[PDB]
Amino acid sequence: AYNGLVTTVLSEDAFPDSSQSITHLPSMWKCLFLTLAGPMTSDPHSPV
Amino acid sequence: NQPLPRLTVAPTYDSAMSNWISTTIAFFIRVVNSVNMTATVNDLTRRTM
Which of A1, A20, A32, B47 qualifies as a cystine partner to A27, CB 3.0-4.6 A? Predict the structure, then answer.
């Protein structure tokens, strides 16, 4: 409702670091839980 | 050198190190099984080397 005043971005700690490969299992659930919480966020850069 | 891999790595023998290591052993298998070592070193302890 208060989009434009405050956007609820994905958190800093949500992302897997960009050196870990996909074969690490705790690093793909960290990407899986990110993807499902994608459209929930009002950040317009969430799909990227 | 070769650039850094990002997947799971395993010890491979395509290196220049492995080219250097395997050819020294391939050379000292020749020195051990040469004629000079044949006349002195016993044949069963030559197989050990």
Answer: A20
Method: cryo-EM
Of A12, A9, A14, residue with least CA distance to A32? A14
Chain A residues in contact with B7 by the CB 8 A cut-off are 21, 23
Residues 6+ apart with CB under 8 A from A10: A34, A37, A38, A41, A43, A46
Q: Is A42 left (phi over 0), alpha (psi -120 to 50) or beta?
A: alpha
The C-alpha atoms of residue B3 and residue A16 are separated, in whole angstroms, by 23
In the numeric block, the tokens 């993807």 are attached to A35
